[PDB]
Design an enzyme around this catalytic site. Structure first.
Site, short mmCIF file in Angstrom:
data_model
loop_
_atom_site.label_atom_id
_atom_site.label_comp_id
_atom_site.label_asym_id
_atom_site.label_seq_id
_atom_site.Cartn_x
_atom_site.Cartn_y
_atom_site.Cartn_z
N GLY A 1 -8.07 -4.99 -7.28
CA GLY A 1 -6.71 -5.34 -6.90
C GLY A 1 -5.70 -4.60 -7.75
O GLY A 1 -6.01 -4.11 -8.84
N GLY B 1 -0.06 -3.26 -13.06
CA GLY B 1 -1.42 -3.07 -13.52
C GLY B 1 -2.41 -3.22 -12.38
O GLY B 1 -2.08 -3.67 -11.29
N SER B 2 -3.65 -2.81 -12.67
CA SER B 2 -4.74 -2.87 -11.70
C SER B 2 -6.02 -3.31 -12.40
O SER B 2 -6.20 -3.11 -13.60
CB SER B 2 -4.95 -1.53 -11.00
OG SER B 2 -5.64 -0.62 -11.85
N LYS C 1 -8.95 -4.47 -16.73
CA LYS C 1 -7.54 -4.45 -16.39
C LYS C 1 -6.87 -3.31 -17.15
O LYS C 1 -7.10 -3.14 -18.35
CB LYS C 1 -6.86 -5.78 -16.71
CG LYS C 1 -5.45 -5.90 -16.16
CD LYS C 1 -4.87 -7.28 -16.41
CE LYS C 1 -3.47 -7.40 -15.83
NZ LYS C 1 -2.84 -8.71 -16.14
N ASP D 1 2.97 -17.59 -13.41
CA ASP D 1 2.57 -16.84 -12.23
C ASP D 1 1.48 -17.57 -11.44
O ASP D 1 0.75 -16.93 -10.67
CB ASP D 1 2.09 -15.44 -12.61
CG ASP D 1 2.15 -14.47 -11.44
OD1 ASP D 1 2.83 -14.78 -10.44
OD2 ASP D 1 1.52 -13.39 -11.53
C1 LIG Z 1 -10.66 -10.60 -14.12
C2 LIG Z 1 -11.38 -10.65 -12.78
C3 LIG Z 1 -12.73 -10.99 -12.73
N1 LIG Z 1 -13.31 -11.03 -11.54
C4 LIG Z 1 -12.66 -10.75 -10.42
N2 LIG Z 1 -13.43 -10.83 -9.17
C5 LIG Z 1 -13.13 -10.20 -7.88
C6 LIG Z 1 -14.19 -10.02 -7.00
C7 LIG Z 1 -13.98 -9.45 -5.75
C8 LIG Z 1 -12.70 -9.06 -5.38
C9 LIG Z 1 -12.48 -8.43 -4.00
O1 LIG Z 1 -13.39 -8.34 -3.24
N3 LIG Z 1 -11.16 -7.95 -3.60
C10 LIG Z 1 -10.95 -7.35 -2.29
C11 LIG Z 1 -9.80 -6.49 -2.35
C12 LIG Z 1 -8.57 -7.27 -2.82
N4 LIG Z 1 -8.37 -8.49 -2.10
C13 LIG Z 1 -7.23 -8.57 -1.70
C14 LIG Z 1 -9.30 -8.74 -1.03
C15 LIG Z 1 -10.76 -8.37 -1.30
C16 LIG Z 1 -11.64 -9.25 -6.26
F1 LIG Z 1 -10.38 -8.86 -5.89
C17 LIG Z 1 -11.85 -9.82 -7.50
N5 LIG Z 1 -11.38 -10.43 -10.45
C18 LIG Z 1 -10.71 -10.37 -11.60
N6 LIG Z 1 -9.29 -10.01 -11.65
C19 LIG Z 1 -8.53 -9.69 -10.44
C20 LIG Z 1 -8.98 -8.70 -9.59
C21 LIG Z 1 -8.26 -8.40 -8.44
C22 LIG Z 1 -7.09 -9.09 -8.16
CL1 LIG Z 1 -6.15 -8.71 -6.69
C23 LIG Z 1 -6.64 -10.07 -9.01
N7 LIG Z 1 -5.41 -10.77 -8.67
S1 LIG Z 1 -4.12 -10.94 -9.80
O2 LIG Z 1 -2.94 -11.47 -9.11
O3 LIG Z 1 -4.41 -12.04 -10.72
C24 LIG Z 1 -3.74 -9.39 -10.68
C25 LIG Z 1 -4.01 -8.18 -9.78
C26 LIG Z 1 -2.27 -9.39 -11.08
C27 LIG Z 1 -4.58 -9.28 -11.95
C28 LIG Z 1 -7.36 -10.38 -10.16
#
Ligand SMILES: Cc1cnc(Nc2ccc(C(=O)NC3CCN(C)CC3)c(F)c2)nc1Nc1ccc(Cl)c(NS(=O)(=O)C(C)(C)C)c1
EC number: 2.7.10.2
Length: 289
Positions: free
Chosen positions: A14, A19-20, A40, A134
């Protein structure tokens, strides 16, 4: 503590607030036995964002809780630039996507289990005088069907020792449909505004992330989709002053919506504490089973 030569990019999870996050495999032995972790990183490595990011790293490192994503380390690479935060990888993604995918499978008692876990994490944050700022289902991650965790702290601030609020204004768009009215008007953030945002999160959960029922959709419908620009913010403020609120989600019992509306109190001091919220959610959950 992590060598960048051993971080093997697998995919992108994401893109966030400047950040990403990437799913990678730390494999220093080069034998495909290393562990999959989340990384991150900043997208534009300005100095302000670099200081914010290290304060975020220090905040996450100071947290140990079953419902807080686990800090694992950092990765410097060259000089001190290109700083990366290493965290545990949670395999079921954000609570938003997970709840959307398994809505036919997740009943109200499971929603309340998730709600209680979120409340306990937020209370732990409060004991550290941390304001998350947030809170949203997109920021809640799923470790398994029985455990969720607060997973991003990019907007978290530490309260001053002498004051119970933090005033912060940010160049850039803000999740205004999750924000307390005092945050919209005076940029004041506190545990009480986190409680407002938690009410919005509970609303999200009981809408099962039906997109027509999202807080932005409902609020834009209430103020009129013709509004654009800063006027939107203005109308939202006015709508909140006239006690306009998100509606009760379909099938939501009146007690859960009452919890939501009590979190949505205009008077900051009359909002419940996270311990009271956890107590009420746990009692409702016990009554349902
Ligand atoms: C630390 C961590 C540990 N594990 C995972 N697991 C995981 C596991 C899988 C998918 C996945 O499959 N994503 C696809 C593409 C994006 N989505 C919109 C739909 C599906 C997945 F996104 C995350 N994330 C973590 N962090 C994280 C990753 C992405 C995002 Cl979008 C976020 N959201 S957020 O608002 O809090 C931020 C971007 C500002 C940090 C957090």
């Amino acid at each position: 503590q992590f060598e960048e030569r051993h971080l093997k990019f697998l995919q992108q999870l994401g893109k966030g607030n400047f950040g990403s996050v990437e799913m990678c495999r730390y494999d220093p032995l080069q034998d495909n036995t290393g562990e999959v972790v989340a990384v991150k990183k900043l997208q534009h490595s300005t100095e302000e964002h670099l200081r914010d990011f290290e304060r975020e790293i220090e905040i996450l490192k100071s947290l140990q809780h079953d419902n807080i994503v686990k800090y694992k380390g950092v990765c410097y690479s060259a000089g001190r630039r290109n700083l990366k935060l290493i965290m545990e990888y949670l395999p079921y993604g954000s609570l938003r996507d997970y709840l959307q995918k398994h809505k036919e499978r997740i009943d109200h008692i499971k929603l309340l289990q998730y709600t209680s876990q979120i409340c306990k994490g937020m209370e732990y944050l409060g004991t550290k005088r941390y304001i998350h700022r947030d809170l949203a289902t997109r920021n809640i991650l799923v470790e398994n069907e029985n455990r969720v965790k607060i997973g991003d702290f990019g907007l978290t601030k530490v309260l001053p020792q002498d004051k119970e609020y933090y005033k912060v204004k940010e160049p850039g768009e803000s999740p205004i449909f999750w924000y307390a009215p005092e945050s919209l008007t005076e940029s004041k953030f506190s545990v009480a505004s986190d409680v407002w945002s938690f009410g919005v999160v509970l609303y999200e959960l009981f809408t099962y992330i039906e997109k027509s029922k999202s807080p932005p959709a409902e609020f834009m419908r209430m103020i009129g989709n013709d509004k654009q620009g800063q006027m939107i913010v203005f109308h939202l403020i006015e709508l909140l002053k006239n006690n306009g609120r998100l509606p009760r989600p379909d099938g939501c019992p009146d007690e859960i919506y009452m919890i939501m509306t009590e979190c949505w109190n205009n008077n900051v001091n009359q909002r419940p504490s996270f311990r009271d919220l956890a107590l009420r959610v746990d009692q409702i959950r016990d009554n349902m089973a």
